[PDB]
Amino acid sequence: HMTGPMCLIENTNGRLMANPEALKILSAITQPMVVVAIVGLYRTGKSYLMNKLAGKKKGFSLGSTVQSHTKGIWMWCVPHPKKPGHILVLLDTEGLGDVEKGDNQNDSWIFALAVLLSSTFVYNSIGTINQQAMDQLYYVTELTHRIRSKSVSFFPDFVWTLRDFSLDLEADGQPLTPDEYLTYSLKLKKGTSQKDETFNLPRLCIRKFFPKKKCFVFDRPVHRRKLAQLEKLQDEELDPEFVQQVADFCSYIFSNSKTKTLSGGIQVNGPRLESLVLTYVNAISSGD
Amino acid sequence: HMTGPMCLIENTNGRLMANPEALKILSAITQPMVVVAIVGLYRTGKSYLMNKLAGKKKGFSLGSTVQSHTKGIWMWCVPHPKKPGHILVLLDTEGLGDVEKGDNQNDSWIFALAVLLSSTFVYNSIGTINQQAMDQLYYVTELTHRIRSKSSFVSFFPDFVWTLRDFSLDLEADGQPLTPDEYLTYSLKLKKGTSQKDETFNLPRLCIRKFFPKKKCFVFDRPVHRRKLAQLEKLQDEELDPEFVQQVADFCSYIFSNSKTKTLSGGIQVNGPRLESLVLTYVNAISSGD
Ligand SMILES: Nc1nc2c(ncn2[C@@H]2O[C@H](COP(=O)(O)OP(=O)(O)O)[C@@H](O)[C@H]2O)c(=O)[nH]1
Ligand SMILES: Nc1nc2c(ncn2[C@@H]2O[C@H](COP(=O)(O)OP(=O)(O)O)[C@@H](O)[C@H]2O)c(=O)[nH]1
Ligand SMILES: [Mg+2]
Ligand SMILES: [Mg+2]
């Protein structure tokens, strides 16, 4: 179908704008869509990983340096490898926490669209699950509600991805599967005090918002850094357990991600996505 | 004399408290003190790097899992290797962002003490410099000021080192090479001037650039190529990536060579007891309710 990705939402001087040439494309796509989005801190291997879902080396473009690379949000519409008659829609996001940009508001808008447009949301981090991440995920989650405001589940399913993973998956003595880890980290605290409650308040809203959760670890894809010629490498050349792990991740998405859905049940196709995108983007550029 | 570290500030159920048996010790030490602290997200190889300043293996203890390890603040006193008649004091901190704890105001207190007790403050992070980091650094910085109050061009604010761990990426920008320092000042570079959201930027980059006089940055390549990472207290330098050895050596050399003597305001040099009594002052100052 589509040979490479194109920018869906442009990001210039803190204005987010739909790119009309993508809407023109969405608007022609009649099949239902599974939508996968990914976000995380910047320089964190997101675009590389998205590309593995499209089963191509080279697509969403990479960038090698300390400078951020992906700006705005890029979509890529491809045939669904495992659900005949569906399109897979990949969303690649500008990474959070650019110091070049120094703009948390803007971060939050992008984060929010991702969650809003997606039927599987993919939060990417390096090494550990981390409270500053928890936090932000909560904040954006609440934000999402407030955006739906202007204008049997349809909230997206969730995946945490852990990169360059090093540490023993172990805790309080006993082994952990990546999923036991992720629920360890949303594990509510006994009962009440009021700081027993401070806690919980994020963990609750997160356990509620995302029906399905899943988690995957990933070893460094290469032992030195020949880490920068990565658009170019086969799979011999990579650490085999990274290839194992990727494969596992792709199979989960292909086999579990659901068809994107509006409220009241209707399945989202091209034009229904086009219309969301406008709706949500128009909502952001007006008055809270 | 001091053979291994010792908890200086206990952290139990969200109340921090000085450890008497460690003041008893400080109270006996009468040489001047260079103080180096380190903080950063948890599980980030802080305690390891810290041992390197003491030139030992084994010392501050490590932990190899996803759970956090170092709790409170550990101190460790030792000769200074370059500055005769001084003591080097090392301060290893509880890492930030523990999901088990889920408690930022506790984080912040601990951040804040490190900054307060130190003459060289070392901020440790994985991979990149990163706005949520700079943000937090700013927040604490302006928290520092507030704690100092609750206690009444030639200055006594700590010097600053950013440490970047498991560093992968090209040090390159806008087309032109970068040294680790050029990176750090790249990140604190002020925006051209005028307008509003121009000055919402800037506002943290200002306070940092004022607060910390000297600034330095160091990169650090993953110690080992597999993950025999997890025994590490017990590997000799042959067995490590020899560019990480290089880099540790270079960072040690800077600390030893450049970290100043810790100083009260009005100029007095800090020794054992004057630390004992800073620790107490700052710790009591946190146990009221601002
Ligand atoms: N250390 C590390 N680097 C990676 C990984 N995956 C990709 N990279 C490299 O990190 C750089 C930026 O990749 P990218 O996907 O653009 O990061 P993004 O900004 O999150 O999109 C590229 O040189 C990638 O080859 C990884 O899993 N670990
Ligand atoms: N990936 C990685 N691991 C490290 C590095 N340095 C130490 N480690 C390992 O990370 C684990 C935790 O070390 P530690 O210093 O206690 O982390 P801390 O929580 O920040 O104190 C140990 O297994 C260390 O051997 C590093 O530079 N990179
Ligand atoms: Mg990218
Ligand atoms: Mg530690």
Q: Got the DSSP string for A138-206?
A: HHHHHHHHHHHH-----SPEEEEEEES--SB-EETTEE--HHHHHHHHT---SS-SSHHHHTTHHHHHH
Across A207-243, b (16+ Cβ under 10 Å) vs e yields bebbeeebbbbbbbbbeebebeebbeeeeeebbeeeb
Going by DSSP bridges, is the β-strand pair A15-18/B33-40 parallel, antiparallel, or unpaired? Answer: unpaired
Element housing B136 (H / E): helix B131-149
Distant-in-sequence, close-in-space partners of B113: CB < 8 Å, separation ≥ 6: B9, B73, B282, B283, B286
Give Cβ neighbours of residue B111 (< 8 Å, ≥ 6 apart).
B39, B93, B96, B136, B140, B143
For residue A66, the SS3 value is coil
Smallest CA–CA distance, residue A100 to chain B, in Å, is 7
Here the tokens at position B51 are 């041992």
CATH number, position A212: 3.40.50.300
Q: CA distances (Å), A63 to each of A69, A103, A227, in order? A: 6, 21, 11
Give the position of tokens 């909230």: A155
Mutate to test the interface with A, among B130, B222, B226, B240 (most CBs of A within 10 A): B130
Strand partners, A213: A158
CA angle B3, B4, B6 (to 5 degrees): 125
Could you give the 3-state DSSP secondary structure of residue A243? helix
* Cα–Cα dist A147/A281, whole Å: 10
Neighbours of B234 (CB within 10 A): 9
Scan for tokens 């025994």, then name that residue. B231
Tell me how long chain B is: 290
Alpha carbons B71 and B16: distance in angstroms, whole number:
11
On whether any CB of chain A is under 8 Å from the CB of B42, the answer is yes
**Structural tokens at position A288:** 């809270």
Which residues are placed with Cβ below 5 angstroms of ligand 4, an ion? B 46-47, 70
Q: Do A171 and B128 touch (CB under 8 A)?
A: no
CB B92 within 8 A of CB B77: no
Nearest CA to CA, how far is A246 from chain B (Å)? 18
Are the CB atoms for B163 and B122 separated by under 8 Å?
yes
CA distance A184 to A200: 13
Q: Which residue in this structure is represented by tokens 């409650």? A: A197
Instruction: Please answer whether residues A96 and A107 qualify as being in contact, where contact means their C-beta atoms are separated by less than 8 angstroms.
Output: yes
Distance A111 CA to ligand 4 centre (A): 31
Ligand 1 atom at shortest distance from the alpha carbon of A163: 27
- Say how far apart CA B113 and CA B41 lie, in whole Å: 16
Which helix (H) or strand (E) is B232 found in, with range?
none
Helix (H, G, I), strand (E, B) or coil at A86: coil
Strand A174-175 and strand A213-217: the pairing is unpaired
Whether residue B45 contacts residue B124, with contact meaning beta carbons closer than 8 Å, is answered with: yes
Given an 8 Å threshold on Cβ–Cβ distance, is A199 in contact with B103?
A: yes
**Residue type (1 letter), A84:** P
**Disruptive mutation site among A128, A139, A188 for chain B (greatest number of B CBs within 10 Å):** A128
- What residue's CA is closest to ligand 2, atom 16? B62
Q: What does the alpha-carbon distance between residue B146 and residue B289 come to, in Å, rounded to a whole number?
A: 12
Atom of ligand 2 nearest to the CA of B244: 27
Resolution for this experimental structure (Å)? 3.2
Q: Which residue numbers come right before each break in chain B (C to N over 2.5 Å)?
A: 152
Taking the C-alpha atoms of residue B220 and residue B252, their distance in angstroms, rounded to an integer, is 12
Return the residues preceding each gap in chain A, C–N over 2.5 A, or none.
Answer: 151
Q: Is the CB of A97 under 6 A from ligand 1?
A: no
| A258 secondary structure, DSSP code | P
What residues form DSSP beta bridges with B159?
B120
A66–B170 C-beta distance less than 8 A: yes
The alpha carbon of residue B226 and the mean position of all alpha carbons in its chain are separated, in whole angstroms, by: 28
Does the beta carbon of B7 lie under 8 angstroms from any beta carbon of chain A? no
Give the per-residue SS3 of A89-125: EEEEECCECCCCCCCHHHHHHHHHHHHHHCCEEEEEE
Question: How do A174-175 and A170-171 pair as beta strands?
Answer: antiparallel
Residue B229: count other Cβ atoms within 10 Å of its Cβ.
17
User: Closest Cα partner for A260 from A249, A273, A274, A250?
Assistant: A273
The tokens for A209 are 């918002």
* Sequence-distant (≥ 6) Cβ neighbours of residue A57 within 8 angstroms: A51, A231, A232, A233
Which residues of chain B does A41 touch, with a Cβ-Cβ cutoff of 8 Å? 128, 130, 132
Residues of B in contact with A43 (CB under 8 A): 127-128, 169
Provide the chain B residues 194-223 that lie in CB contact (below 8 A) with chain A. 197, 201, 205, 221-222
Residue with tokens 């010629």: A229
* Total length of chain A: 288
Give A45 Cα–ligand 1 centroid separation in angstroms: 3
Q: Which of residues 59-118 of A touch B (CB under 8 A)?
A: 64-67, 96-99, 101-104, 107
The binding site of B for GTP consists of 40-47, 62-64, 92-96
CB A124 within 8 A of CB A49: yes
What strands, in cross-sheet order, belong to the sheet with B215-220? B15-18, B6-12, B73-79, B87-93, B33-40, B120-126, B159-165, B215-220
Which amino acid, residue A101?
K
A41 marked among binding-site residues: yes
Q: Is the CB of residue B70 less than 8 Å from the CB of residue B76?
A: no
Closest Cα partner for A118 from A264, A23, A18, A260? Answer: A260
- Cα(A227)–Cα(A243) distance, rounded to whole angstroms? 15
Terminal-to-terminal C-alpha distance of chain A? 38
The radius of gyration of chain A from alpha carbons, rounded to an integer in Å, stands at 19
Helix (H) or strand (E) holding B229: none
B66, B112, B72: which is closest to B94 by C-alpha? Answer: B72
Domain range for B128 is 1-290
Amino acid code (one letter) for A112: A
Q: What phi, psi does B286 have (nearest 5°)? A: -95, -35
Name residue A263's amino acid: S
A158: tokens are 């969730």
Q: How would you label B154-186 residue by residue, b for 16+ Cβ within 10 Å and e otherwise?
A: eeebbbbbbbbbbbbbebeeeeeebebeebbeb
B217's tokens: 């940055």
Question: Residue A95 is encoded by which pair of tokens?
Answer: 């990474």
Ligand 4 center from residue B68 Cα (angstroms): 7
- Residue B237 corresponds to which tokens in the numbers above? 């330098």
CA-nearest of B104, B98, B125, B40 to A185 is B98
If you search the block for the tokens 């330095």, which residue do you land on?
B216
Structural contact between residues B85 and B284, judged by C-beta atoms closer than 8 angstroms? no
Compute the distance between CA of residue B184 and CA of residue A226 in angstroms, rounded to an integer.
Answer: 24
Which one-letter amino acid corresponds to residue A287? G
Residue nearest to atom 5 of ligand 1 (CA): A45
Q: Tell me the C-alpha to C-alpha distance, in Å, between residue B68 and each of A162, B59, B111, B177.
A: 17, 17, 16, 37
Ligand 1 within 6 A of CB of A47? yes
Tell me the backbone φ, ψ of residue A122, rounded to 5 degrees. Answer: -130, 105
Q: Which residues of chain A neighbour B14 with C-beta distances below 8 Å? A: 195
Residue A97: CA count within 13 A, CB half-sphere: 21
Number of domains composing chain B? 1
Residue B119: strand, helix, or coil: coil
Distance from C-alpha of B66 to C-alpha of B76, rounded to nearest angstrom: 25
Burial class (CB in 10 A: 0-12, 13-18, 19+), A39: buried
| Cα–Cα dist A288/B191, whole Å | 26
Here the tokens at position B253 are: 């050399």
User: Which secondary-structure segment (H or E) carries A207?
Assistant: helix A201-209
Contacts of A28 (CB under 8 A, 6+ apart): A270
Question: Which one-letter DSSP state was computed for residue B285?
Answer: H
Judging contacts by C-beta atoms under 8 Å, the chain A residues touching residue B64 are 167-168, 170
Q: B249: Cβ–Cβ under 8 A, 6 or more apart, which residues?
A: none
Who among A99, A168, A169 is closest to B131 (CB)?
A99
Cα of A64 from ligand 3 centre, angstroms: 10
Is the C-beta atom of A238 inside 6 A of ligand 1? no
The Cα of A152 is separated from the nearest Cα of chain B by a number of Å equal to 30
- For residue B8, the one-letter residue type is L
Task: Quote the CA–CA distance of A11 and A278 in Å, as a whole number.
Answer: 15
Output the 3-class SS for B28-55: CCCCEEEEEEEEEECCCCHHHHHHHHCC
Distance CA(A98)–CA(A104), nearest Å, equals: 9
